[PDB]
Write an enzyme that holds these catalytic residues in place. Structure first.
Site, PDB file in Angstrom:
ATOM      1  N   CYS A   1      25.536 -11.430   8.776  1.00  0.00           N
ATOM      2  CA  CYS A   1      24.859 -10.142   8.707  1.00  0.00           C
ATOM      3  C   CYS A   1      25.837  -9.033   9.057  1.00  0.00           C
ATOM      4  CB  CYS A   1      23.651 -10.095   9.653  1.00  0.00           C
ATOM      5  SG  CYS A   1      22.890  -8.432   9.707  1.00  0.00           S
TER       6      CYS A   1
ATOM      7  N   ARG B   1      24.676  -5.925  12.093  1.00  0.00           N
ATOM      8  CA  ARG B   1      24.320  -6.349  13.438  1.00  0.00           C
ATOM      9  C   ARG B   1      24.646  -5.330  14.517  1.00  0.00           C
ATOM     10  NH1 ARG B   1      27.289 -11.799  14.124  1.00  0.00           N
ATOM     11  NH2 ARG B   1      28.457 -11.198  12.207  1.00  0.00           N
TER      12      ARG B   1
ATOM     13  N   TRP C   1      17.152  -2.209   6.767  1.00  0.00           N
ATOM     14  CA  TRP C   1      17.278  -1.262   5.672  1.00  0.00           C
ATOM     15  C   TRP C   1      18.435  -1.727   4.789  1.00  0.00           C
ATOM     16  CZ3 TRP C   1      17.573   0.516  10.793  1.00  0.00           C
ATOM     17  CH2 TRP C   1      18.878   0.634  11.305  1.00  0.00           C
TER      18      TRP C   1
ATOM     19  N   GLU D   1      23.578  -4.216  -2.151  1.00  0.00           N
ATOM     20  CA  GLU D   1      22.603  -5.278  -2.379  1.00  0.00           C
ATOM     21  C   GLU D   1      21.793  -5.000  -3.635  1.00  0.00           C
ATOM     22  OE1 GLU D   1      20.602  -6.778   1.319  1.00  0.00           O
ATOM     23  OE2 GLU D   1      21.359  -4.874   2.114  1.00  0.00           O
TER      24      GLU D   1
HETATM   25  C1  HEM Z   1      19.305  -2.891   9.845  1.00  0.00           C
HETATM   26  C2  HEM Z   1      19.992  -2.938   8.698  1.00  0.00           C
HETATM   27  C3  HEM Z   1      20.560  -4.269   8.146  1.00  0.00           C
HETATM   28  C4  HEM Z   1      21.538  -4.320   7.245  1.00  0.00           C
HETATM   29  C5  HEM Z   1      22.257  -3.098   6.631  1.00  0.00           C
HETATM   30  C6  HEM Z   1      21.801  -5.707   6.954  1.00  0.00           C
HETATM   31  C7  HEM Z   1      22.743  -6.177   6.079  1.00  0.00           C
HETATM   32  C8  HEM Z   1      22.836  -7.466   5.613  1.00  0.00           C
HETATM   33  C9  HEM Z   1      23.444  -7.894   4.364  1.00  0.00           C
HETATM   34  C10 HEM Z   1      24.062  -6.976   3.293  1.00  0.00           C
HETATM   35  C11 HEM Z   1      23.354  -9.220   4.310  1.00  0.00           C
HETATM   36  C12 HEM Z   1      23.815 -10.096   3.138  1.00  0.00           C
HETATM   37  C13 HEM Z   1      22.493 -10.346   2.411  1.00  0.00           C
HETATM   38  C14 HEM Z   1      22.659 -10.861   1.011  1.00  0.00           C
HETATM   39  O1  HEM Z   1      23.733 -10.612   0.404  1.00  0.00           O
HETATM   40  O2  HEM Z   1      21.701 -11.515   0.518  1.00  0.00           O
HETATM   41  C15 HEM Z   1      22.678  -9.683   5.509  1.00  0.00           C
HETATM   42  C16 HEM Z   1      22.404 -10.973   5.858  1.00  0.00           C
HETATM   43  C17 HEM Z   1      21.623 -11.344   6.924  1.00  0.00           C
HETATM   44  N1  HEM Z   1      20.911 -10.504   7.763  1.00  0.00           N
HETATM   45 FE1  HEM Z   1      21.253  -8.509   8.031  1.00  0.00          FE
HETATM   46  N2  HEM Z   1      20.957  -6.494   7.718  1.00  0.00           N
HETATM   47  C18 HEM Z   1      20.155  -5.633   8.461  1.00  0.00           C
HETATM   48  C19 HEM Z   1      19.147  -6.043   9.333  1.00  0.00           C
HETATM   49  C20 HEM Z   1      18.878  -7.339   9.694  1.00  0.00           C
HETATM   50  C21 HEM Z   1      17.852  -7.760  10.642  1.00  0.00           C
HETATM   51  C22 HEM Z   1      16.893  -6.750  11.330  1.00  0.00           C
HETATM   52  C23 HEM Z   1      17.916  -9.110  10.738  1.00  0.00           C
HETATM   53  C24 HEM Z   1      17.079 -10.075  11.604  1.00  0.00           C
HETATM   54  C25 HEM Z   1      16.295  -9.653  12.599  1.00  0.00           C
HETATM   55  C26 HEM Z   1      18.997  -9.571   9.875  1.00  0.00           C
HETATM   56  C27 HEM Z   1      19.400 -10.872   9.683  1.00  0.00           C
HETATM   57  C28 HEM Z   1      20.250 -11.309   8.683  1.00  0.00           C
HETATM   58  C29 HEM Z   1      20.586 -12.690   8.404  1.00  0.00           C
HETATM   59  C30 HEM Z   1      20.071 -13.919   9.199  1.00  0.00           C
HETATM   60  C31 HEM Z   1      21.408 -12.703   7.346  1.00  0.00           C
HETATM   61  C32 HEM Z   1      22.086 -13.908   6.658  1.00  0.00           C
HETATM   62  C33 HEM Z   1      21.190 -14.935   5.988  1.00  0.00           C
HETATM   63  C34 HEM Z   1      22.049 -16.170   5.844  1.00  0.00           C
HETATM   64  O3  HEM Z   1      22.454 -16.761   6.890  1.00  0.00           O
HETATM   65  O4  HEM Z   1      22.325 -16.560   4.681  1.00  0.00           O
HETATM   66  N3  HEM Z   1      19.535  -8.474   9.263  1.00  0.00           N
HETATM   67  N4  HEM Z   1      22.400  -8.586   6.279  1.00  0.00           N
HETATM   68  C1  LIG Z   2      16.676  -7.661   7.020  1.00  0.00           C
HETATM   69  C2  LIG Z   2      17.498  -7.403   5.769  1.00  0.00           C
HETATM   70  C3  LIG Z   2      18.389  -6.338   5.681  1.00  0.00           C
HETATM   71  C4  LIG Z   2      19.109  -6.138   4.500  1.00  0.00           C
HETATM   72  N1  LIG Z   2      19.980  -5.107   4.385  1.00  0.00           N
HETATM   73  N2  LIG Z   2      18.943  -6.964   3.447  1.00  0.00           N
HETATM   74  C5  LIG Z   2      18.074  -8.002   3.505  1.00  0.00           C
HETATM   75  C6  LIG Z   2      17.901  -8.912   2.304  1.00  0.00           C
HETATM   76  C7  LIG Z   2      19.195  -9.665   2.007  1.00  0.00           C
HETATM   77  C8  LIG Z   2      18.996 -11.075   2.500  1.00  0.00           C
HETATM   78  C9  LIG Z   2      19.059 -11.345   3.852  1.00  0.00           C
HETATM   79  F1  LIG Z   2      19.325 -10.346   4.714  1.00  0.00           F
HETATM   80  C10 LIG Z   2      18.861 -12.641   4.309  1.00  0.00           C
HETATM   81  F2  LIG Z   2      18.919 -12.897   5.629  1.00  0.00           F
HETATM   82  C11 LIG Z   2      18.595 -13.672   3.403  1.00  0.00           C
HETATM   83  C12 LIG Z   2      18.533 -13.383   2.040  1.00  0.00           C
HETATM   84  C13 LIG Z   2      18.242 -14.468   1.035  1.00  0.00           C
HETATM   85  C14 LIG Z   2      19.555 -15.100   0.579  1.00  0.00           C
HETATM   86  C15 LIG Z   2      19.307 -15.993  -0.629  1.00  0.00           C
HETATM   87  N3  LIG Z   2      20.602 -16.364  -1.220  1.00  0.00           N
HETATM   88  C16 LIG Z   2      21.220 -17.378  -0.358  1.00  0.00           C
HETATM   89  C17 LIG Z   2      20.403 -16.925  -2.566  1.00  0.00           C
HETATM   90  C18 LIG Z   2      18.726 -12.090   1.600  1.00  0.00           C
HETATM   91  F3  LIG Z   2      18.661 -11.806   0.288  1.00  0.00           F
HETATM   92  C19 LIG Z   2      17.342  -8.231   4.666  1.00  0.00           C
END
Ligand code: HEM
Ligand SMILES: Cc1cc(N)nc(CCc2c(F)c(F)cc(CCCN(C)C)c2F)c1
Ligand code: HEM
Ligand SMILES: Cc1cc(N)nc(CCc2c(F)c(F)cc(CCCN(C)C)c2F)c1
Ligand SMILES: C[C@H](O)[C@H](O)[C@H]1CNc2nc(N)[nH]c(=O)c2N1
Ligand SMILES: C[C@H](O)[C@H](O)[C@H]1CNc2nc(N)[nH]c(=O)c2N1
Ligand SMILES: [Zn+2]
Lengths: 414, 417
Positions: free
Chosen positions: A113, A116, A285, A290
């Site tokens: 993420c 964070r 957000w 994305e």
């Molecule tokens: C607040 C603004 C946030 C931004 C800008 C952000 C940004 C991102 C982005 C760009 C990704 C890659 C997602 C993808 O390409 O599908 C990601 C993954 C992830 N985000 Fe964040 N996120 C935010 C908030 C959060 C919150 C609030 C949580 C949980 C409480 C969270 C948990 C995660 C997790 C667990 C992943 C990775 C999923 C995995 O392990 O494959 N995010 N985030």
């Molecule tokens: C909270 C938040 C903030 C942000 N900016 N974007 C998101 C959506 C992007 C995103 C996640 F964050 C996530 F944890 C998991 C997935 C699925 C990945 C499926 N992929 C392996 C095929 C995902 F798409 C959520």
């Protein structure tokens, strides 16, 4: 073994001691690096009585350390109280304070993420008193409204009751609370979002009346206590959407693109102190890429590159004209421009990665490290002009954590 | 044990058995992934006795004779016998010409960070193991440059100097690349030329190089033969092919004064074949456009032209969410590709190059059982996810023969005076 990471753009070197607290496994070995595997077995997810108490102890230990009560009467009392509850009930319940700490730290530990830096401002909604899918819907509407906040988005998670025997699981079947439907055409192409074709069919197969548009918000499919899941339409007035226009290309609005404001992941599993929360939708957000890079320009998604480059009148004969790259930038300018115009929170990949470097600095200084997955942290466009490209990162698995879990339709005893 | 990799854009799934033949270590453990560490302990080479050398030789010769369909033949057993006695009696051994060519091609084939490996079997191997002096090295390198350049119709080549013996008589090219621009730290803290090459430029100047102190001065060769102090040589300028960078629509782009050289030739890595270490093994191919347009021109720590390019384009530079950096980046990379093609100098854009790598990789899985690939390095530094490698899972492991990093020689060299 006390590891160093270097930033090759700034020469900043950080020393990582936090990885020594790592518990779970990465999927790599000394002989092979699996750093680009999307879903190694470890990243996916019943607990016997024996495994549970060490997991609880490790969690309570770090919790009481975080409040500077390590080794206090209150610490030992809580350890004993949970120890007795596991012996008796074969599980235990988290105090509200422990649930909140656990959820914030599951985000803090999410090595993939980039957002964070905000991890400690998460709004945690305790939904462990929920019993039915209708109640889940109510909790989710309240989450969506709270998080959306008229476009001034706020991070939130809503935590439904923890797994017990695995037959009473709470699950949100949707991958995100808000997502556009996908339909296979007889014509053979795909209308709407191809990534959601299977889920869109399960919704129709369950009763949903699809408008068969390009941007149809999917209904919620909610499963409480292991029962059959139920359809619910999210009130449209709660689904903030942004029409996509370009600040220079007037024909851009004619593409008819829009996207929703609230990214809310709903199909992951939250692990705290050995306890498994199978329904824990969380939202923040968007980072602009994305939507603009992945959602709009992935070949297996909305795949709009050719159409946009056409309207730009770009030389699409040869790849070396970089028409795709030009179009890609313009699409992503439009997404950011549109959200900023409608006052919906969004962050560009430059600001977000700069924030993440600052966050890494903070975590190394105050925590001794920051697990970070470079393959995921580096944005899907303009990688090397963002600071994270040049940042060495150590990827390791800390708990509390968010994990993947199988899709429910494969598992649900109907 | 079999391992599967998935392409998430095509759902094509490949099965890797080749990782079982992996000897060296990755740097990762069950508990930490070092996938993004630039120069991990395991990819470098700081020193090797007859003890461990014969199994390294035997392993290579087994591979070699398998590839020529002669495994277990009399030629195979006699060669193993011959190498064994040469080791115990002389403490090293000499590769046959065929083995050297095989070894150098496979070191490229095994280079998991190289996106251009579809080309690995068409490598021109120049045997320079009879070289004894820095002047001889200069002559070999000149011939390599002229051959590889081929008037802009670039050809992959490697020149292989004598292997290490006791680590005290190394052949080394002190340059990191054969053709590279000088960098000068100015008293005011700014840098003139290529900031990546400031340290090496200062060594050349200390060694007597008369620096023009321009923005694009081709560095001299600093060549070390047989562990002797290195010597300076100027590559004949008629052998250094350069491309002035212009843009197909922006006529002011030429006035930025940019150019680049046509021949990317890495000269500081170590080639390991059958436990033998070739510390001077310059190799060259042709450029992927983003190496120049993204990294060389737009890295903050390199020429860093994003500001001035975006100024001339008159983009909104006040906020980053205007993506003025991304806009300028694309135009710069268009210019690089347009200029090389216009001058008929071989270059490949990152769309073509990554598409070819996917085909290469699928072929390697089918004919070889795998293809070690370092995603962190294979994915191009711009437009990553609209290239097909972004969506491709990759397994990274170390096979030999290999190219390895080695410490910069000025940090290890015992100076004669
Ligand atoms: C607040 C603004 C946030 C931004 C800008 C952000 C940004 C991102 C982005 C760009 C990704 C890659 C997602 C993808 O390409 O599908 C990601 C993954 C992830 N985000 Fe964040 N996120 C935010 C908030 C959060 C919150 C609030 C949580 C949980 C409480 C969270 C948990 C995660 C997790 C667990 C992943 C990775 C999923 C995995 O392990 O494959 N995010 N985030
Ligand atoms: C909270 C938040 C903030 C942000 N900016 N974007 C998101 C959506 C992007 C995103 C996640 F964050 C996530 F944890 C998991 C997935 C699925 C990945 C499926 N992929 C392996 C095929 C995902 F798409 C959520
Ligand atoms: C023919 C055209 C070639 C292309 C387009 C190409 C492309 C590339 C690129 C873009 C990189 C990443 C470099 C960086 O970002 O610094 C790379 C790495 C590499 N290339 Fe190739 N290459 C080519 C030929 C060759 C040849 C002929 C060899 C050796 C005989 C070779 C060996 C390597 C190695 C060893 C690396 C990895 C360096 C490391 O491990 O850090 N390449 N290649
Ligand atoms: C033959 C060839 C073809 C091509 N297209 N490009 C190149 C130059 C790119 C390149 C390599 F290929 C390589 F093997 C090693 C390095 C050094 C990396 C330094 N890094 C740790 C800071 C390098 F820069 C060479
Ligand atoms: C195969 C590869 O791991 C896969 O395409 C990954 C690459 N990096 C990613 N990075 C982010 N942020 N999101 C993704 O979905 C992916 N996909
Ligand atoms: C820290 C990180 O490993 C480093 O910046 C890497 C990332 N990927 C790369 N990929 C390529 N091709 N070349 C590079 O120099 C780098 N640098
Ligand atoms: Zn790894």
């Amino acid at each position: 073994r006390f590891l160093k990471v270097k930033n090759w753009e700034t020469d900043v070197v950080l020393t990582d001691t936090l990885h020594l607290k790592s518990t779970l496994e990465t999927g790599c070995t000394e002989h092979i690096c699996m750093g680009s595997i999307m879903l190694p077995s470890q990243h996916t997810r019943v607990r016997t009585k024996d495994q549970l108490f060490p997991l609880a102890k490790e969690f309570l230990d770090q919790y009481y350390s975080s409040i500077k009560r390590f080794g206090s009467k209150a610490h030992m009392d809580r350890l004993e109280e949970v120890n007795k509850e596991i012996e008796s009930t074969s599980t235990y319940q988290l105090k509200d304070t422990e649930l909140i700490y656990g959820a914030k730290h599951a985000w803090r530990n999410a090595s993939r993420c980039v957002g964070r830096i905000q991890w400690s401002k998460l709004q945690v909604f305790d939904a462990r008193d929920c019993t039915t899918a209708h109640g889940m819907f109510n909790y989710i509407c309240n989450h969506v409204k709270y998080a959306t906040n008229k476009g001034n988005l706020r991070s939130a998670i809503t935590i439904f009751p923890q797994r017990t025997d695995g037959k009473h699981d709470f699950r949100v079947w949707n991958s995100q609370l808000i997502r556009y439907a996908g339909y296979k055409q007889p014509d053979g192409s795909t209308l709407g979002d191809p990534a959601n074709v299977q889920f869109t069919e399960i919704c129709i197969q369950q009763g949903w009346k699809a408008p068969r548009g390009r941007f149809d918000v999917l209904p919620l499919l909610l499963q409480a206590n292991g029962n059959d899941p139920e359809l619910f339409q999210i009130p449209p007035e709660l689904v903030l959407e942004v029409p996509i226009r370009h600040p220079k290309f007037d024909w851009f609005k004619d593409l008819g693109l829009k996207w929703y404001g609230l990214p809310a992941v709903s199909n992951m599993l939250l692990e705290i102190g050995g306890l498994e929360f199978s329904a824990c939708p969380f939202s923040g957000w968007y980072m602009g890429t994305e939507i603009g890079v992945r959602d709009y320009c992935d070949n297996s998604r909305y795949n709009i590159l050719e159409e946009v480059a056409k309207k730009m009148d770009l030389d699409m004969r040869k790849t070396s004209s970089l028409w795709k790259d030009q179009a890609l930038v313009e699409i992503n300018i439009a997404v950011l421009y549109s959200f900023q115009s409608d006052k919906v929170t969004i962050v560009d990949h430059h600001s977000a990665t700069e924030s993440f470097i600052k966050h890494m600095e903070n975590e190394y200084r105050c925590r001794g490290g920051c697990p970070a997955d470079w393959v995921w942290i580096v944005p899907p466009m303009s990688g090397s002009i963002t600071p994270v490209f040049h940042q060495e990162m150590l990827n390791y698995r800390l708990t509390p954590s968010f994990e993947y879990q199988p899709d429910p339709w494969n598992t649900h005893v109907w």
